[PDB]
Amino acid sequence: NYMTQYFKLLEKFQIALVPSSLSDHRPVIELPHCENSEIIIRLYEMPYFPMGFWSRLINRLLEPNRMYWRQGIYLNWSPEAYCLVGSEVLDNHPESFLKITVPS
Amino acid sequence: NHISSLSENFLEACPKVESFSARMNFLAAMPFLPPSMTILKLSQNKFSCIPEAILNLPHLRSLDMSSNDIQYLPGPAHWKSLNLRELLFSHNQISILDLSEKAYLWSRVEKLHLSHNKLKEIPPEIGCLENLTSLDVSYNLELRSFPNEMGKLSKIWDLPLDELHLNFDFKHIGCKAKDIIRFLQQRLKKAVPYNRMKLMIVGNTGSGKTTLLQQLMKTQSATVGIDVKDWPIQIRRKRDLVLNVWDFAGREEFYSTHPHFMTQRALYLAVYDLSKGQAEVDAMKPWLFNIKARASSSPVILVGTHLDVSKACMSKITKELLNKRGFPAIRDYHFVNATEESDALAKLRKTIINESLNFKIRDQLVVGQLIPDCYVELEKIILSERKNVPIEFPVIDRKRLLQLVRENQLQLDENELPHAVHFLNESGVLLHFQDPALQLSDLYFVEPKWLCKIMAQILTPKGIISRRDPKNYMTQYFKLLEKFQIALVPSSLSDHRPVIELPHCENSEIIIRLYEMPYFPMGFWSRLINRLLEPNRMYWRQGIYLNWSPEAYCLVGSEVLDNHPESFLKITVPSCRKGCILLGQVVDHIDSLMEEWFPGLLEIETLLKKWALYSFNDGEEHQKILLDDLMKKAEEGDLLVNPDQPRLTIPISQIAPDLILADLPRNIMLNNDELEFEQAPEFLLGDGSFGSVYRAAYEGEEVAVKIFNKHTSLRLLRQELVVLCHLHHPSLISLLAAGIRPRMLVMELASKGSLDRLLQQDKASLTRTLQHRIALHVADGLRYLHSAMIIYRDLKPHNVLLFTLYPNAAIIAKIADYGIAQ
Amino acid sequence: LLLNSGSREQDVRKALTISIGKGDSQIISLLLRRLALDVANNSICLGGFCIGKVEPSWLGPLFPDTNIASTLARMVIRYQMKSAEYITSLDLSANELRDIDALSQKCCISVHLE
Ligand SMILES: Nc1ncnc2c1ncn2[C@@H]1O[C@H](COP(=O)(O)OP(=O)(O)NP(=O)(O)O)[C@@H](O)[C@H]1O
């Protein structure tokens, strides 16, 4: 009967749905805005992703049909209002990236 | 009138009557009509035979005795009249169309209606009636024949063929109905037999599919494409028989293009790979289900291709589970080594030949069908042009094809040539797509194995790709690949679904519907996704989730159920009005896909259970109760669905807003309360009889209701409604209500009727400004329809409905926009 | 004056129902002249207008039987510029009548009714 201690610790330990072992394949997403002026992009280029990075990020980002995967969120309210915290990779670039897409 | 029998001298001293019409009267005999008749209308009367008094009027011109209990028709050498022009005999117990005595006496006959009768066979003396315009022999279901002599009736422009067995069944219908006379005429010219059918070898991932084909024709890489070959069979019964073999690809990467090459006129083989016994038979079941969904009437001869190993009684599961459960007609089965010849392989050849000679769909014997010699000459020409055109580009230009047919003295004009090449594509000689959306009207693929090796070559985030590498015909590549469901490629596209959340989960605002089927057909998901892009669509292999808002989205997933082998298709949508619109569009798209591609499913268990889900308690629904859609549709009289007690209920619009007409914009709700209407009295039916058009008072105003007979479909009705929902032009007949119980339609009432009756009866009213106002209003309607990006295709004074005769009015003329509905 | 200018047919029809509520012969005669008289072809088309009864004083003037404001207009626009055969058709059908006997008496209409 200390099961809620288990669940609260697992939430504290970034286990809860589990962020690890969660669908590494990203889906083939489309976006309603692609005219390259109404889209704000920002990169967060780092050499590697730290160990418990994506679990801590996804857990601290649920605060909106969030169709996430291991390395993304895409929480969407509207074509006029959404976000996409992806993880883009670049051609001929060993350093990892973190690509934030949002309408303007 | 309820008259029983006319007086013997009823028309005694009226020697000028012309149009004595006594319809739906309890009449039995005609007592001495005068000799000055032209037209009589004696239909729906209790007649037993054509009375002799009508057979002596020397100027009779028309005769309506439809829906009468008459048996024998007197032949054309008894009528004593030389101006017969319209004989109508629908819905009678007539058996013979005897036209053998002197058939040339009926040469002036224009219309002739023998529909809905017990006719046996059309006599071949019909060909002399050179002035036939509308011969009606539909709705007999016992004819199954057409004499080649009727190819001379060139004046025929329409020929109803509804609900009758057929012989050629050549996929050309009577929508043109003059081409049918052209084919009958050309068959009357030459009438050569034909011996060619397809043999589609079907298996999977390495079996006796190529080696078996190498041994069968008495002649190693895996198949890429479908590898079209052919081989003749010299039957000694001297029947020179050739059949082309299509050994389909085995790997699942090509499984999204095989439905383009599975026709109903073919004999299939199914291969086991008997090394892994008792499981490969279970693995062969999706192939058999796909054969059933594609070609419902084609036999399948199984082959076990490993008699080198053993698992010997693997025929037990075949004899138990594979006989008849929704699987195609397994006519036989064998077992063979398929590497060198044997008595088993020899009897396999013999059974393949014997099952080929007795295909006989609808008892027609398609292995020895009859065609004009122009078809066989075109076949020899094209088969010689395959060797005459190099392998770099076997596609043939349309003008080159015309030059090829003009290079010889064939009787093929440009009229019959589309059906010619369609029939040759049916027998698999040259593949050609006459779809005008494709740029294939000048593309005629001789040697289709080139096309199948090329168009399947491309299959050799995760799945998308833009233009990245062909002599400047690359847009033909891309258009064909779109036509072949290749384009981004739907196959090899991210099988893992994402962990999606939904903003609405309280189990009352979510409409769910299932589409439970045993397996997914071959090219199902590619065809669905391609036909569903018409909104950040974050799709995958087996889903879409196109989303406009938390208030408006859709999710065509593919849910799988615990302890359920049958697959499913789960449509999730919110329960606002936009949710109902999206659900209706999606359901209509899916049904159109299944009707146009897999008719074998939607046929009789029906192999496809359309379910519906509903909750009693909003939230914590506790496994929403499944309910089949069919009897839920049958519960249309009760607009609420309730449990065993009436302490709760649910409206049908809540959980099935497509049956209840609410998925369309709600301005055309039927609203049966204020409909003062009676379909019975013909007073109101006087507003039109060819269509079931009546007169009624609805919502206080006068309307002209149209009752739908059983010739329409509810889905087709909804398709007609959505285009007719939002036109709204002042020169257009607007709609007021539409719905079910009964399937009716409430359109506005034109006071002065149609234009043709006005100019026929009251021509003094057209006064050079009413004419101009009518023309201006009709031109306004036509310009609106062309700005509505639609055609009308039948404009006539039968459709110009007038509203007043005051010239300086706001509205005068209105057109009937139901012509776009058909 | 108001009917010779541009007036909507729905407006004239609604005002016809109003002026037939307080029945006054001359005004409703003018409204019917604007609505249902087609002089070009000797045509009365008094059709769909659901009037209760019919008085022969109403359609009476339908049968054939001072430049003050213009000069004021001309002066003020100058200042604006400086500063810048019987009728044989009678159709009375959709009007929900109940007794046509009002037309039966020898009114001022019978010479036209012949
Ligand atoms: N809304 C309407 N108001 C007044 N008259 C109408 C209306 N709809 C139809 N009619 C009349 O009724 C006739 C029959 O209607 P309709 O259903 O269009 O038959 P159709 O025009 O001959 N073609 P079809 O529908 O195949 O029988 C028309 O030709 C018109 O004269």
Ligand SMILES: Nc1nc2c(ncn2[C@@H]2O[C@H](COP(=O)(O)OP(=O)(O)O)[C@@H](O)[C@H]2O)c(=O)[nH]1
């Ligand atoms: N030794 C042996 N090989 C077999 C037998 N049946 C099939 N095969 C093998 O099956 C292979 C052919 O695979 P196939 O199905 O024709 O290729 P696919 O159609 O592209 O999948 C050949 O390599 C054969 O060796 C058999 O009875 N004995």
